């Protein structure tokens, strides 16, 4: 049932996801694994079964509130419009993009330095951060309307689109 759902949040050292317990695996195969290795939330985020790992239930609830804050209730209704019309003009923060790309083509940089500036504000809400980290899948707002942002991340793997970046992008 969980794997059907659109968003999976899990709690570190508390949430685990596995189809067969370490003991059953040992008995059938003799392979030896810990719950952290087989089940653990960070391992499942790296494998991409889970979209967010947090440290507490309160953080999980907040992440849900934020996630839903970009989405309509359903396929047919419209998403919330939040802080439309801010900064109608060219700001210093826009002018800073003119020199944000390194001069030497081999230099890596953090794409967040662009994402935090090209959208309405810093509310780039990242989803599946750890899954295929060469790729960023995030919500943002343009003139207060929600948008999904797919960006490459030169800071990781030179931004090459690996298997998990591909599947993350597709599902997003």
């Amino acid at each position: 049932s969980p794997i059907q759902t659109d968003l999976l949040v899990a709690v570190r050292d508390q949430g685990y996801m596995f189809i067969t317990g370490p003991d059953v695996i040992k008995d059938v195969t003799g392979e030896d694994v810990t719950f952290d290795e087989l089940g653990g939330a960070d391992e499942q985020a790296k494998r991409g079964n889970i979209h967010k790992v947090v440290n507490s239930e309160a953080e999980a609830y907040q992440y849900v509130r934020d996630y839903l804050s970009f989405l309509p209730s359903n396929h047919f209704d419209n998403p919330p419009i939040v802080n439309p019309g801010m900064e109608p003009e060219i700001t210093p923060h826009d002018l800073e993009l003119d020199s944000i790309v390194p001069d030497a083509d081999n230099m890596a940089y953090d794409m967040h330095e662009i994402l935090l500036r090209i959208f309405d504000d810093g509310d780039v809400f990242e989803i599946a951060e750890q899954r295929g980290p060469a790729m960023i899948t995030a919500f943002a707002r343009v003139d207060g309307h929600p948008v999904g942002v797919i960006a490459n991340q030169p800071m990781v793997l030179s931004g090459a689109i690996d298997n998990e970046a591909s599947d993350k992008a597709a599902s997003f």
Partner: protein, 133 residues
């Protein structure tokens, strides 16, 4: 090796130089058959294809598409004369706050005669207008 300011260009191997290069090409799109043709058009008291759009649309609402397009015909030496924009200016703009798609043919470029990329640009703006409604 230093140079007079009239000759010097920022190093194209830098972001600043690439941006300057974009500025140069953009400027070059304002007078794609040379300034003399624009002067010859104003001498008759007529707006250019660009000015007609900028007058019709709301101020600053115009977003130009395919500004740097060049024709690719090699017939009868056309490869020697490849003016930027291929003689049509295309984009979208608000009128009275409501969006519209627009194209405007430039008589200075080959008499405004329709060619390959010229047609492709009009086609693109049409498709955009239809999909966006």
């Amino acid at each position: 090796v230093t140079e007079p300011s009239a000759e010097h260009q920022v190093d194209i191997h830098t972001t600043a130089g690439k941006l300057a290069d974009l500025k140069r090409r953009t400027e070059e799109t304002l007078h794609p058959v040379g300034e003399a043709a624009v002067d010859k058009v104003h001498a008759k008291g007529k707006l250019t294809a660009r000015e007609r759009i900028l007058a019709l649309l709301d101020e600053g609402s115009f977003v130009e598409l395919d500004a740097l397009a060049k024709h690719r015909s090699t017939n009868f030496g056309l490869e020697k004369n490849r003016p930027l924009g291929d003689g049509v200016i295309t984009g979208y703009g608000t009128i009275d706050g409501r969006d519209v798609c627009i194209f405007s043919q430039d008589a200075t470029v080959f008499g405004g005669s329709l060619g390959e990329v010229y047609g492709e640009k009009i086609v693109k703006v049409q498709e955009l207008a239809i999909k966006t409604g």
